[PDB]
Scaffold this active site. Structure first.
Site, PDB file in Angstrom:
ATOM      1  CG  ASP A 127      -8.442 -10.922   4.561  1.00  0.00           C
ATOM      2  OD1 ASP A 127      -8.376 -12.117   4.284  1.00  0.00           O
ATOM      3  OD2 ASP A 127      -7.955 -10.050   3.845  1.00  0.00           O
ATOM      4  CB  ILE A 186       2.628   2.085   4.469  1.00  0.00           C
ATOM      5  CG1 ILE A 186       1.178   1.613   4.306  1.00  0.00           C
ATOM      6  CG2 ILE A 186       3.075   2.044   5.932  1.00  0.00           C
ATOM      7  CD1 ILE A 186       0.836   0.301   5.006  1.00  0.00           C
ATOM      8  N   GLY A 231       0.830  -1.240   0.000  1.00  0.00           N
ATOM      9  CA  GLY A 231       0.000   0.000   0.000  1.00  0.00           C
ATOM     10  C   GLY A 231       0.850   1.270   0.000  1.00  0.00           C
TER      11      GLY A 231
HETATM   12  C1  KWJ Z   1       9.589  -1.278   7.935  1.00  0.00           C
HETATM   13  C2  KWJ Z   1       8.997  -2.280   8.097  1.00  0.00           C
HETATM   14  C3  KWJ Z   1       8.253  -3.519   8.334  1.00  0.00           C
HETATM   15  N1  KWJ Z   1       6.915  -3.509   7.744  1.00  0.00           N
HETATM   16  C4  KWJ Z   1       6.742  -4.088   6.516  1.00  0.00           C
HETATM   17  O1  KWJ Z   1       7.693  -4.474   5.855  1.00  0.00           O
HETATM   18  C5  KWJ Z   1       5.330  -4.246   5.993  1.00  0.00           C
HETATM   19  C6  KWJ Z   1       4.841  -5.671   6.161  1.00  0.00           C
HETATM   20  N2  KWJ Z   1       4.374  -3.315   6.597  1.00  0.00           N
HETATM   21  C7  KWJ Z   1       3.164  -2.990   5.846  1.00  0.00           C
HETATM   22  C8  KWJ Z   1       2.088  -3.938   6.141  1.00  0.00           C
HETATM   23  C9  KWJ Z   1       1.247  -4.716   6.399  1.00  0.00           C
HETATM   24  C10 KWJ Z   1       4.585  -2.812   7.849  1.00  0.00           C
HETATM   25  N3  KWJ Z   1       3.553  -2.250   8.493  1.00  0.00           N
HETATM   26  C11 KWJ Z   1       3.784  -1.774   9.722  1.00  0.00           C
HETATM   27  N4  KWJ Z   1       2.749  -1.199  10.372  1.00  0.00           N
HETATM   28  C12 KWJ Z   1       1.357  -1.292  10.164  1.00  0.00           C
HETATM   29  C13 KWJ Z   1       0.523  -1.080  11.258  1.00  0.00           C
HETATM   30  C14 KWJ Z   1      -0.833  -1.154  11.137  1.00  0.00           C
HETATM   31  C15 KWJ Z   1      -1.384  -1.444   9.887  1.00  0.00           C
HETATM   32  C16 KWJ Z   1      -2.719  -1.591   9.413  1.00  0.00           C
HETATM   33  O2  KWJ Z   1      -3.766  -1.492  10.035  1.00  0.00           O
HETATM   34  N5  KWJ Z   1      -2.644  -1.873   8.095  1.00  0.00           N
HETATM   35  N6  KWJ Z   1      -1.333  -1.916   7.707  1.00  0.00           N
HETATM   36  C17 KWJ Z   1      -0.536  -1.654   8.790  1.00  0.00           C
HETATM   37  C18 KWJ Z   1       0.848  -1.584   8.905  1.00  0.00           C
HETATM   38  N7  KWJ Z   1       4.965  -1.816  10.356  1.00  0.00           N
HETATM   39  C19 KWJ Z   1       5.986  -2.378   9.723  1.00  0.00           C
HETATM   40  C20 KWJ Z   1       5.852  -2.907   8.444  1.00  0.00           C
END
Ligand code: KWJ
EC number: 2.7.11.1
Length: 317
Positions: free
Chosen positions: A153, A27, A25
């Site tokens: 999910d 992020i 996504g």
């Molecule tokens: C850097 C690093 C490690 N890291 C990742 O590689 C990837 C796996 N993702 C994205 C996803 C899924 C991460 N996502 C988050 N935090 C959140 C918290 C809450 C949510 C939520 O509600 N939806 N998606 C979320 C992601 N932290 C670390 C990672």
């Protein structure tokens, strides 16, 4: 390029955050605003979507309603848990780029997803691992259910480890979460026209297959299918995922006779008894029925005794 690295954004509560590098996504890593820039060890992420995006709105409402830090810490204290695998909500706001409106939200930063680790371990988790994951997931599901929500999910790609603790797993992605019991009134056993989201086909509930809104039994059923997938590397219907009718048919037949699911999924006579017993218990839930989460946890704990272990909270990944 929704954010510049080092851009400072301010949430609705006037808390200031600095954006880090991008990471499925839209992020980015994030931290509290400061003179220093955002490290690769940032404790937060920021999730950003157009303001007209429905899923982020759904997700934000879930986080605001049930994932306030104090709300979670109170539960942990009261239920005497080591931790609770629900990501904490840190804030949200609006952000303009190039004349369009974006919504953002700040959450806990985690380590790896379980799907990467599952693949790296040749698509197997140990009995110990699966039981320890599942006990924690039952804590998560009990929490969100008691706060009027189901996830719908559950799967390894939506399970992330604590960056600082590899023995703590968190359930993420509430964008298609569903408020099954608003104001304590359970939804009726029927379609919700506002929802068309069916889940992940290999893991989704028979209820979802039938086109009804997800409820608590469905979340438990999903975890059941996950447990078998993790233990064995397979599910019976995995070669026909393009055909939902087939998947539904197979799940219904297997639900009718759990022993035959065990025979199919496990090498003859090698079936962990707690998995069968878990599936038998979930099968008895009515659509609106509140699960006995402690009984379900007790069933899985018998599995730990059987392999000469205990619930020490070690995931053994
Ligand atoms: C850097 C690093 C490690 N890291 C990742 O590689 C990837 C796996 N993702 C994205 C996803 C899924 C991460 N996502 C988050 N935090 C959140 C918290 C809450 C949510 C939520 O509600 N939806 N998606 C979320 C992601 N932290 C670390 C990672």
């Amino acid at each position: 390029e929704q954010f510049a690295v080092g851009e400072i954004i301010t949430d609705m509560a006037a808390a200031a955050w600095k954006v880090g590098l991008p990471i499925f996504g839209c992020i980015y890593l994030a931290d509290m605003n400061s003179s220093e820039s955002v490290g690769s060890d940032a404790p937060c992420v920021v999730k950003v979507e157009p303001s007209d995006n429905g899923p982020l709105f759904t997700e934000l409402k879930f986080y605001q309603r049930a994932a306030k830090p104090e709300q979670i810490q109170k539960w942990i204290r009261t239920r005497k848990l080591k931790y609770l695998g629900v990501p904490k909500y840190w804030g949200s706001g609006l952000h303009d780029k190039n004349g369009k409106s974006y919504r953002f939200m700040i959450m806990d930063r985690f380590g790896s997803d379980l799907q990467k680790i599952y693949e790296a371990n040749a698509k197997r988790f140990s009995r110990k691992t699966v039981l320890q994951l599942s006990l924690r997931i039952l804590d998560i599901l009990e929490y969100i259910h008691e706060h009027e929500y189901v996830h719908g999910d559950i799967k390894a790609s939506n399970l992330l480890l604590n960056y600082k603790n590899p023995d703590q797993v968190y359930l993420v992605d509430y964008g298609l979460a569903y408020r099954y019991c608003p104001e304590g009134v359970h939804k009726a056993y029927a379609a919700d026209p506002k929802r068309c989201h069916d889940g992940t086909i290999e893991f989704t509930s028979i209820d979802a297959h039938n086109g009804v809104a997800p409820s608590r039994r469905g979340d438990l059923e999903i975890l059941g299918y996950c447990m078998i997938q993790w233990l064995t590397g397979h599910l019976p219907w995995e070669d026909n995922l393009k055909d939902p009718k087939y998947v539904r048919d197979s799940k219904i037949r297997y639900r009718e006779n759990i022993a035959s699911l065990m025979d199919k999924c496990f090498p003859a006579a090698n079936a962990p008894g707690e998995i069968a017993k878990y599936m038998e218990t979930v099968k008895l839930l009515d659509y609106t029925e509140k699960p006995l989460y402690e009984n379900l946890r007790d069933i899985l704990l018998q599995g730990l005794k059987a392999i000469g272990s205990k619930d020490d909270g070690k995931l053994d990944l």
